[PDB]
Design a protein around this ligand. Structure first.
Ligand SMILES: *[C@@H]1O[C@H](CO)[C@@H](O)[C@H](O)[C@H]1NC(C)=O
Ligand SMILES: *[C@@H]1O[C@H](CO)[C@@H](O)[C@H](O)[C@H]1NC(C)=O
Lengths: 78, 35, 301, 218, 150, 45
């Protein structure tokens, strides 16, 4: 048992959450432009989701929506 | 059939683990201080 | 069997026949011993949402605005603590403790103990929700003949096909109550119960209508329990089986007493026993909507 | 005070904050993560438990068959249920206790059950399910036993028995009984408490402790 | 007609000063049929029993009205004086069976027809004939249901 | 670890007549006591 680490059925959710990470990252980059190029936002997302100690409009959205995304992902995992 | 008829919590094991880890931490701190 | 009884070819008849209005007027029945009727068999197929209104907090308003109001109060007190942007930073303090994976948490007194207690409450809530979800996995659409599908089988693009067995009482009931539905169903008749059952199993027939007892027995005996009746209590006119006797026969008087003695002495229950995902996708969509709303708020801010 | 604040932040994860100190921190974090994981597992195991007593499956439950003073249940009076119990000579031991808890009317027995006077009450399924639908504080247990029907009692010399039976059959065929059933029988804080308490405590404290600290500093 | 007081089947309410009761309507708006019914004021024994008039309505009275309309009958609903269904109970000189309650009233000639939630029983059938059962049901257990709390 | 702990928590002192307590209760600190009804098969056995 427990071998369904990835997904039991409808495995597209793992790509959907990655797409959500990508769109929030590009939105943060756009906000930073209207005030850290490619891999900063995704690394911060991995750090806030998988706790490892990683971490004007861009800063606000990073502090606001990343917390909600991480809480939703951990709730789904639980 | 008719004649002959009819949680879990943090136990002492957790306290023992706390004591063991505290002793190990104290021993490691003493070893590092000596080293 | 009724014709056999009427023509004096038999005295008593027990063949699982049901009581009907046109049957009791030509022959005399006894007290029914088993409950039956007209039922519909349909195919049988964590679906409920988790961490949402159906899962818990059906009111769904106060719980989800508690975080907003406490964040607003935190912003107000942080602004009041004067003796960067307070509105855009103090929210992180509250949103950094609702879950235990937040790295950007800057809390430079007893307020630290208070936020630790709040984080303990949040993790207790998360554990309780997880445990409830662990115990919230244990789990009918026709809901009787009054549904529009029965009245309008051709309303949808795929026609809704029913089934019935002729030389019976179900056809009589549908003829006497829904003549148009009876005419529609006469085009999809089955010569026997087994053919209708296998057609339903293979998906040829969306639903099948027959006697309640036989339908329940076949649902119980179906492999994998893939076919079930229409809930419980949505049955049509409920009758019994009884035993058919010629009118004026002197045997019915003691037959009814014997049947009542059997049913009252427990001689029937033993015989009856012997013989018979989506939530994750919705959460992702809601998180995307919340992200868009937060981006708009930040742009306004 | 910083060290104990950091220790509490490690124990309660809210971000509150030579070689010997580092290794002590390593051991403390490794112990705290195990402790919180074990506590979450224990809480999850504790929450999945049937605190209320198990629902009565039916007459085969030994709890009903064996009478006790801590669980009293009986019928209303000498009704059809009493006749059914009398005919089957198998539960005389509970019959003795049932004979001591009779009530004048079924409604009185239901009211007594609502007042917790009677642990259980045996009666017809239709009446009990109607009461459960109308009154949410009462529920029905047991699948089916002593199945029977409701008939129009008439004397033997009445010559309209066949007409009454035919009328009942016609009413069933026309769906009149279904309409009557639909019209008459077919009718319709800890979790909030803890969150309200913690919210109020936090909103009071964030001001109380700050003004206390300001007074102490001044 | 003799009927027993059962809330799901025979709702019993006292009459007003004019001898009638309030007229109500269902959810669909159809009128609720009510009849003038006579019964004892107090069901408990050892009380000043009075045959005061009431209004009794419900499933049983609706079935009775339908049967009377179909068979051109003129019914007269009455309530059980004893307030019980009535069976064979042991009395003084116990070597004797006598029917009381509604069944006793029917067997004494006071009543002519019984319309009530009475189950079909062997003892009942040995002296009273019954038609086809209009409702099929069983017996369940009523237990106080605490609100589900974590 | 959480799943293993959740699964593991779902869970006899004399282990029969061959225990040392029945053979010689005086070798244990507590005064182990065992009894039986006389005039029966147990005493004969
Ligand atoms: C009896 O049913 C068969 C099919 O099962 C049908 O062909 C036949 O016409 C029916 N009998 C009558 C008299 O209609
Ligand atoms: C029974 O109904 C028939 C109609 O078929 C009628 O002729 C007869 O008089 C009725 N009998 C009674 C006793 O009402």
């Amino acid at each position: 048992t427990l071998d369904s680490f990835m997904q039991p059925f409808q495995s597209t959710l793992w790509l959907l959450v990655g797409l959500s990470v990508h769109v929030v990252a590009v939105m943060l980059y756009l906000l930073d432009r209207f005030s850290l190029t490619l891999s900063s936002a995704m690394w911060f997302s991995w750090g806030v989701l998988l706790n490892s100690g990683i971490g004007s409009f861009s800063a606000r959205i990073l502090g606001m929506v990343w917390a909600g995304f991480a809480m939703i992902i951990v709730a789904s995992y639980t | 059939t008719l004649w002959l008829t009819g949680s879990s919590q943090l136990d002492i094991d957790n306290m023992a683990g706390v004591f063991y880890m505290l002793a190990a931490a104290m021993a490691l701190s003493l070893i590092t201080f000596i080293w | 069997m009724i014709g056999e009884v009427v023509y004096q070819r038999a005295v008593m008849a027990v063949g699982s026949l049901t009581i009907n209005e046109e049957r009791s007027e030509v022959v005399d029945f006894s007290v029914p011993f088993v409950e039956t009727g007209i039922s519909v068999m349909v195919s049988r197929s964590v679906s409920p949402s988790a961490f949402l209104e159906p899962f818990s907090a059906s009111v769904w308003v106060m719980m989800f605005v508690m975080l907003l109001i406490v964040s607003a109060i935190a912003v107000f007190v942080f602004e009041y603590f004067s003796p960067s942007f307070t509105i855009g930073k103090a929210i992180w303090l509250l949103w950094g403790l609702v879950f235990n994976n937040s790295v950007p948490v800057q809390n430079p007194t007893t307020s630290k103990i208070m936020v630790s207690v709040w984080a303990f409450f949040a993790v207790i809530f998360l554990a309780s929700y997880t445990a409830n979800l662990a115990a919230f996995m244990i789990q009918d659409q026709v809901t009787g003949l009054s549904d529009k599908k029965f009245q309008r089988p051709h309303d949808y693009s795929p026609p809704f096909r029913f089934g019935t067995v002729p030389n019976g009482s179900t056809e009589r009931n549908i003829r006497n109550n829904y003549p148009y539905m009876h005419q529609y169903m006469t085009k999809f008749n089955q010569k026997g119960v087994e053919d209708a059952l296998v057609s339903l199993k293979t998906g040829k027939l969306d639903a099948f209508i027959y006697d309640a007892a036989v339908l329940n027995y076949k649902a119980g005996r179906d492999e994998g329990c893939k076919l079930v009746t229409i809930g419980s209590g949505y049955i049509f006119a409920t009758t019994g089986y009884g035993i058919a006797l010629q009118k004026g026969s002197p045997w019915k008087r003691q037959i009814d007493l014997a049947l009542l003695q059997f049913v009252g002495d427990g001689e029937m229950e033993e015989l009856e026993t012997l013989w018979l995902d989506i939530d994750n996708m919705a959460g992702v969509f809601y998180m995307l909507a919340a992200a868009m709303a937060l981006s708009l708020i930040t742009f306004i801010w | 005070s910083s060290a104990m604040w950091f220790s509490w932040g490690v124990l309660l994860n809210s971000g509150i904050g030579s070689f010997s100190a580092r290794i002590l921190g390593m051991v403390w974090a490794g112990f705290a993560m195990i402790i919180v994981a074990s506590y979450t597992a224990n809480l999850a195991a504790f929450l999945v438990l049937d605190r209320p007593e198990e629902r009565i499956t039916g007459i085969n439950d030994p709890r009903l068959r064996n009478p006790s003073d801590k669980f009293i249940y009986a019928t209303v009076k000498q009704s059809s249920v009493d006749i059914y119990f009398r005919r089957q000579v198998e539960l005389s031991t509970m019959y003795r206790h049932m004979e001591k808890h009779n009530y004048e009317s079924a409604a009185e027995a239901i009211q007594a059950v609502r007042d917790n006077k009677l642990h259980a009450f045996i009666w017809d399924s239709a009446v009990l399910e109607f009461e459960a639908s109308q009154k949410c504080d009462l529920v029905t247990t047991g699948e089916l036993f002593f199945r029977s029907g409701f008939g129009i009692g008439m004397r033997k010399d009445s010559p309209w028995k066949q007409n009454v039976s035919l009328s009942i059959l016609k009413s069933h065929e026309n769906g009149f009984m279904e309409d009557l059933d639909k019209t008459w029988v077919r009718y319709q804080e800890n979790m909030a408490g803890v969150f309200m308490l913690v919210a109020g405590g936090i909103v009071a404290g964030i001001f109380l402790i700050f003004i206390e600290i300001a007074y102490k500093r001044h | 007609i003799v009927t027993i007081h059962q809330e799901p089947f025979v709702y019993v309410k006292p009459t007003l000063s004019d001898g009638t009761c309030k007229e109500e309507f269902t959810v669909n708006g159809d009128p609720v049929k009510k009849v003038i019914c006579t019964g004892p004021n107090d069901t408990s024994p050892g009380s000043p029993r009075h045959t005061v008039p009431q209004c009794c309505y419900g499933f049983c009275i609706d079935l009775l009205i339908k049967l009377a309309r179909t068979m051109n009958f003129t019914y007269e609903v009455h309530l059980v004086a004893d307030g019980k269904f009535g069976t064979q109970e042991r009395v003084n000189n116990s070597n004797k069976k006598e029917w009381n309650g509604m069944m006793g009233e029917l067997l004494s000639g006071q009543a002519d027809m019984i319309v009530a939630p009475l189950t079909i029983n062997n003892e009942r059938a040995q002296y009273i004939e019954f038609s086809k059962p209009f409702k099929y049901q069983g017996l369940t257990i009523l237990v106080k249901k605490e609100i589900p709390r974590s």
